């Protein structure tokens, strides 16, 4: 479970990535971690 504002997307790339676009976050690390 993430904090609010994080879009957890699963791309055909085969990788999970966390999208918080205020600033435009695309990160490998769970922001809850």
């Amino acid at each position: 479970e993430l904090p609010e504002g994080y879009e957890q997307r699963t791309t055909v790339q085969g990788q999970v990535y966390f999208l918080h676009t205020q600033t435009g976050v695309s990160t490998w690390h769970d922001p809850r971690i």
Binding site: E7, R9, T11, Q13, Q15, Y17, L19, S26, T27, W28
Partner: peptide, 8 residues
């Protein structure tokens, strides 16, 4: 309409 992917 398009988000960016992570570079690994």
């Amino acid at each position: 309409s398009d988000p960016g992917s992570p570079f690994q």
